[PDB]
Design a protein around this ligand. Structure first.
Ligand SMILES: Cc1cc2c(cc1C)N(C[C@H](O)[C@H](O)[C@H](O)COP(=O)(O)O)c1[nH]c(=O)[nH]c(=O)c1N2
Ligand SMILES: Cc1cc2c(cc1C)N(C[C@H](O)[C@H](O)[C@H](O)COP(=O)(O)O)c1[nH]c(=O)[nH]c(=O)c1N2
Ligand SMILES: Cc1cc2c(cc1C)N(C[C@H](O)[C@H](O)[C@H](O)COP(=O)(O)O)c1[nH]c(=O)[nH]c(=O)c1N2
Ligand SMILES: Cc1cc2c(cc1C)N(C[C@H](O)[C@H](O)[C@H](O)COP(=O)(O)O)c1[nH]c(=O)[nH]c(=O)c1N2
Lengths: 364, 364, 364, 364
């Protein structure tokens, strides 16, 4: 039987590196491999974290700043910080309480929770665990069947999703050789997608191949027609992808390379953010992820055109060790680091971060 | 007595790195040294594989792609994938069945087999092993004697060669210090070139020095006059070399640095491909090799102007461990990776790969 | 009880690297951690020392130079070399005689001593130890209370400070994870700031947070109004910061990133010096620090627009091992290396260093 | 008593790296330290060998080349190859037969021998050992005394020196910390400079400081007036140094950084060669050294504007292990590698090397 973390309470860590190492003591080796590794030779995965020092934050002086405020007004939401939970499959790999513990902790921190289509809990359980006022978005892995897609969108609406995130960069799985070496299969059901995917004993290759490969702009139009929720396209890393998305009626862009898990030999997401921000030209909101481990990474992404930054692996490691308490402590780590960076950079508010000018590193 | 691999059947590997390591268990150390190493301080050899991340593949989204097709129409041939067997000497160093096993396996995969002038089998055996419908090209190490050169061209014609590949970048051998340390000599005859080279007990320095050093455009004209087969010049890495080749009547260009085995301190072949593709301007087909270990490398070469990509060492390691079955499994590894890359890049067909735009890596 | 170094006399070292290692034998581990480490992942701290080879010194020939003279005329001062003591807190962490030993040694070398607001001695003791003719500057960590700030400025005047250095890049402490791992607290009082900070048993986070966070140009105007001493702004790394400082009446600019102790992910100070020197355009003097370990680093900073170069950690390591004798030996190491560099570069005097042209390193 | 190598005969090596290691078995540790190491943190010393791959040699094809000829016509000399012996002090540190063995071996190879002012033999012994037809140049470390300088120039003339090489980049010694750690002193006299320097028991700092520091263009004019031999200025790495040298009547330029032994933090000599070749514009001959370990390095230097390439440490390691036979084997190693590079690059003669175009490495 697969046994994940069970602790609910405060965890001891300094940074996200010793947290990642500590989680190896509570997550079974196959599950830890699935969470921790990446595609191919890991060039793109390693570049994600390195890329934040391609651009340098200037520690300005005499900026008349104290008690910097991370409070973020986004649509009709008031977030504690411009930091949100990325959609991550199967939280039962990390903690017995799974998405109930992660939705509760992210609700208590006070920010957006993005639910995965491949969750180990129902969306009804995720909504119940966060509470009725918790801001929640729905990440969509589409079926090949449009009847099933209508049913999943009506289900997202019933559960008060405020946006639909169409993940478009995992039409098939990457060459994840750690999962191959481990013979990884999912241990739990995937109730949200149960009409097309059973989860238990399935390879990640089989799971992604059960979803829709032939995604196109018509899929954005389908979601608009049948849900009337704003659509974010996730995995956007070029101008061409921005224009395809906006022309089809997308109301948000989510810059990502899937945490280096997909196409090895592609760019770091932070480098792609420059190209995407120029193409979007503030027409719609931008979410950014992949490689974020420090407050300075969040600051640099927002200065470079992101409106929100999403957290993946670090949140899952905190969940494994401390449940709702532990995942909230990870969000608090990022908020506390962002407050330090804001004071030393000279930015009183999140809007001031957007107006900061980074220096390109000519000696990387 | 020199004893190579003898197994015929399925081999267990994840990627080309663990395959290269596994082959050390079946190839005698001197033969393994000859296959695996490179010239001088190994700068050029190491740069070949690194250079593929000088250019970054964009994982596009909403591209309306599924079941990408690697089928390649080349002249009157239908290939399984745009992936061919490079000319590699003396397959008897790797497997007892030598070029019979490699020609059979490449025929069964369904692509072009390039026979080496320094083969351990006759071209008659290579044609018989592939079958009459197998696409085969003849790689020519020319004699100093034009009578011998006429005889070798008539022999290539009798065996249904569809092209002659004039290898022009090995007029002498490189400074291969692993072969020097090992006291390497060839253990088998070289029947195709037996009129000028006996093979058995000969150093690689002596073998290359027995062939023609003073290659010139007149040699292309000689091959056209006496065979009426299309001539590819192999080792082309600059505009000057393209113009010298085309002005002399070459009908193909093969971009290579001989797998880093020749002039240490020269460029990586993938970097040279940009210069050669601009000079050729689609006037003749381009074959590309040197350093290819992943589907993403094949995709990037084709996006950068290659029509076909040739495989060297990885195919020989598969041959050593599994014979015809093992070499076909290596071609299947590259085809399966290329299908994954095509889906995630958004390319339905091989012609779509040619139209993909890579992003230059400013932070290598 | 905290026990620091006690030796007064000559120390044995080759360079600043073996000196840093030797100091681990006499400084208690918590104090050594506080002195030696830096913020976050240590990118900025490591880049400081690497950055000196971003620009290359040309060893000119036939320059008609011998017995190069480091004598520096600065205001009405005559310095032995263009090399000064940086403000560093709590010298009692390094040596029992603390700032008495460091002020005496720097006075005997014959250069400017910058006293820290967080000193373990009174400014009266620092003035008494240096003697009445010793050039001393006062580094100011301001109170939130303007009455306390007036008292501290009157105290600096009574002790013959010739400049006030407003440190503006430590409004809060950086994420110094070595100090967190060690549970570091200060062992000694901070008498200069005793009206707002007690020092003993306090975290570095608490100490910086007791000083003023909301520094602005109004603070420069306050210091001018109440002391009539020239004001240097310390931590300046951009054109915007130069203009804010000069517009508010600053009479000096001190280029620094606080030895990599503050905002990780920011630039190396030597790289920032180019931007600051262009903005200042010789309107006021420039002091430079962060990463200086060799005479060639001092030469390059002066050629790039610095008038004076400040020494931090290396001086503290020398103090720990040899007291006044040991700190003077560190200044002598830098002067002797600078004389070697001046001879080989072809610069007779310090003004000749300013006119030297470095070559940018295109292959870093 | 200092005991150096004594063997006269053939030595076993593959490349200059295993030769450098083998010499540790026959050269006493202090002498080996003096020969092998460099200044400061060894940035410049390490960059010298790395810098050859800043520019890439194109292996051209169909160039109509065989049996490439390294024969070099230089003034009225006929050299075996465009490869000469650099001036290196005190060959008695390496072999008992000292400069007698090195002059004989370089004469038998058939190239220019540059005698050091700090030789362990007289120039009469060096001339006698090479024979009357051996091309020999005299490297001059000048006295502060012009009477002594006239005597040394008349001595060079009597011994048939064909050029005077004024070494201008060692007016003082670099910070050679291996020699400091070892307490190195010279074990033998320096007869050529005996009027001002005794050699025995002297530090390298004392030896360089006994020679002239205040070198200027007047020193070139002095040498022309009193010897009527062509003057080469050694250590030239910039346009300013070329113009100072030529304006003062220099008839040759020797590009060098003294093998990384002098000013750490300066450029690699191969990178400086581009700047110097553009300034010289073929007005006088150029000699190049520092970091040469491969035939490809010699080829690249000549393609980049050198007329001759000088060898230092590798020749001394060969001398230590095999005397005259061993030093000739090192010159033969470089000639044999240069012949391989010429064949693969497509250059029939040394003048053809000068016309080769390298590709700048954009991904170093
Ligand atoms: C274990 C695991 C599982 C998933 C993911 C990631 C990881 C680590 N990601 C990608 C995710 O949304 C995000 O892009 C990355 O996690 C960001 O990189 P970092 O983990 O922060 O480095 C992902 N994305 C998505 O849209 N749906 C999913 O179900 C999952 N599943
Ligand atoms: C053992 C071995 C032997 C040979 C070669 C290579 C190797 C590894 N190569 C070069 C070959 O065609 C090709 O250019 C490289 O193998 C490509 O680099 P990779 O091996 O794929 O990295 C080669 N080329 C050629 O034209 N004729 C030959 O006989 C040989 N022999
Ligand atoms: C232990 C310690 C303590 C302090 C400092 C540094 C160090 C190492 N620094 C920063 C200092 O003035 C200077 O900018 C750096 O020391 C320069 O970098 P290097 O130490 O030379 O590499 C510092 N700066 C300041 O203005 N007031 C202070 O009290 C201190 N305290
Ligand atoms: C042991 C030793 C001793 C000397 C030198 C070098 C070495 C290694 N060099 C510098 C020499 O001429 C040359 O510039 C370098 O040796 C070139 O670098 P490589 O040794 O080839 O890497 C040197 N140069 C010079 O003009 N007169 C000298 O007496 C000496 N002495």
């Amino acid at each position: 039987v697969y046994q994940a973390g069970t602790h609910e309470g405060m965890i001891d860590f300094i940074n996200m590196e010793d947290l990642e190492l500590a989680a190896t003591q509570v997550i079974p080796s196959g599950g830890y491999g699935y969470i921790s590794s990446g595609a191919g030779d890991l060039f793109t995965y390693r570049e994600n974290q390195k890329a934040f020092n391609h651009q340098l934050v200037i520690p300005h002086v005499l900026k008349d700043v104290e008690l910097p405020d991370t409070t973020t007004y986004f649509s009709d939401e008031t977030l504690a910080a411009p930091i949100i939970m990325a959609p991550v499959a199967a939280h039962g790999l990390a903690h017995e309480q799974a998405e109930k513990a992660s939705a509760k902790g992210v609700s208590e921190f006070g920010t957006i929770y993005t639910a995965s289509s491949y969750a180990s809990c129902t969306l009804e359980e995720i909504r119940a665990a966060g509470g009725p006022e918790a801001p929640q978005w729905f990440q969509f892995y589409m079926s090949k069947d449009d009847g099933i897609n209508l049913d999943i969108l009506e289900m997202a609406k019933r559960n008060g999703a405020k946006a639909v995130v169409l993940t478009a960069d995992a039409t098939v799985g990457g060459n994840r050789e750690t999962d191959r070496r481990n013979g990884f299969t999912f241990p739990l059901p995937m109730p949200i997608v149960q009409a097309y995917q059973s989860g238990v004993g399935q390879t990640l290759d089989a799971v992604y191949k059960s979803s829709k490969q032939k995604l196109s702009p018509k899929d954005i139009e389908f979601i608009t027609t049948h849900s009337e929720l704003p659509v974010y396209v996730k995995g956007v890393q070029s101008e061409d992808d921005v224009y395809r998305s906006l022309d089809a009626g997308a109301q948000g862009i989510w810059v990502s390379n899937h945490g280096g898990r997909q196409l090895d030999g592609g760019p770091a997401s932070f480098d792609s953010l420059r190209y995407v921000a120029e193409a979007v030209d503030k027409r719609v909101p931008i979410v950014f992820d992949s490689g974020v481990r420090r407050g300075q990474h969040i600051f640099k992404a927002i200065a470079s055109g992101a409106d929100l930054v999403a957290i993946g692996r670090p949140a899952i490691y905190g969940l494994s060790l401390g449940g709702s308490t532990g995942i909230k402590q990870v969000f608090d780590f990022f908020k506390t680091e962002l407050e330090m960076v804001m004071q030393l950079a000279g930015t009183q508010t999140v809007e001031d971060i957007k107006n900061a000018k980074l220096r390109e590193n000519r000696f990387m």
